[PDB]
């Protein structure tokens, strides 16, 4: 097997795209691209689509676990919430892409160890006033799971203690940070 088999991923993941159009409805500007369950199939995907820095304003990329949709109305998201990374305008150039690729590697690599199942997916927002990257998790009351994910993520993105990042539930956002790391 060692010689000819693809390296398999624990989960199947689906990459989604959100387009800015504003005439059309949200449920129509959100559209699937492709699914994949191997390392090699992930690179074939990653290598031919555009970088986050080159997307027109208001557009999103999303990687979610197969069967969970990148909207908080979904069963696995509704009690959930998200670790949020806020990027200033200058960080588009320097940090946005390398943070996005690191996020994708955390997800597909299953890097949050015994709380891997709490992770649903991640969303990059390309915006004129400040880009954003969020890892979404399934239950906002799992203090232990939510905390560990945050710390893993900051560590992996390489942020210093100085920087503090917020976790907020989708309820609180529809309607402050429940947790900070």
């Amino acid at each position: 097997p060692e010689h000819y088999i693809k390296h398999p991923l624990q989960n199947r993941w689906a990459l989604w795209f959100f387009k800015n159009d504003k005439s059309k409805t949200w449920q129509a500007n959100l559209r699937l691209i492709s699914k994949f369950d191997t390392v090699e199939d992930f690179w074939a995907l990653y290598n031919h689509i555009q970088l986050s820095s080159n997307l027109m304003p208001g557009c999103d990329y999303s990687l979610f676990k197969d069967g969970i949709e990148p909207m908080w109305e979904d069963e696995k998201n509704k009690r959930g919430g998200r670790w949020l990374i806020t990027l200033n305008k200058q960080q588009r150039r320097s940090d946005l892409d390398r943070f996005w690729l690191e996020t994708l590697l955390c997800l597909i690599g299953e890097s949050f160890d015994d709380y891997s199942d709490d992770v649903c997916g991640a969303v990059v927002n390309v915006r004129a006033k400040g880009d954003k990257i969020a890892i979404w998790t399934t239950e906002c009351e799992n203090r232990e799971a939510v905390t560990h994910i945050g710390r893993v993520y900051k560590e992996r993105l390489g942020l210093p203690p100085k920087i503090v990042i917020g976790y907020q539930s989708h309820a609180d956002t529809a309607t402050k940070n429940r947790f900070v790391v």
């Binding site: 398999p8 991923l9 624990q10 390392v39 590697l105 597909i108 690599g109 890097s111 160890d113």
Partner: peptide, 12 residues
């Protein structure tokens, strides 16, 4: 259960 490090994923 399949786990891969940052280094494993870039190498592959």
């Amino acid at each position: 259960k399949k786990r891969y490090s940052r280094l494993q994923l870039l190498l592959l």
